[PDB]
Ligand binder design. Structure first.
Ligand SMILES: [Cu+]
Length: 91
């Protein structure tokens, strides 16, 4: 399935909803104001992207979920600490 995510300080579209491996998340926001970095668990916990992490910056980034945990954060200064981070469990 394909789901739109409201990528902002107050992230919407992920809370209390069920996801499955293979689903496509579409991060929507204004290009240049944020980014989407796919990180690992430790990177998610400390709001810091690990070396080589993949960045998406188009404002309408299509990312497929892999089975298990999928972590994403915005890496601009103050944004992750401001709540721009999500952990999705794709069953
Ligand atoms: Cu951001």
């Amino acid at each position: 399935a394909v789901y739109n995510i409201g990528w902002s300080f107050n992230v919407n579209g992920a809370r209390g909803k069920s996801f499955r491996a293979g689903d496509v998340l579409v991060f929507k926001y204004i290009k240049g104001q944020h980014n989407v970095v796919a990180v690992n668990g430790r990177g998610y916990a400390s709001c810091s992207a690990p070396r080589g992490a993949r960045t998406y910056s188009s404002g309408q980034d299509r990312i497929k979920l892999t089975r298990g945990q999928n972590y994403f954060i915005c890496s601009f200064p103050g944004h992750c600490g401001g709540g721009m981070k999500i952990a999705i469990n794709a069953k």
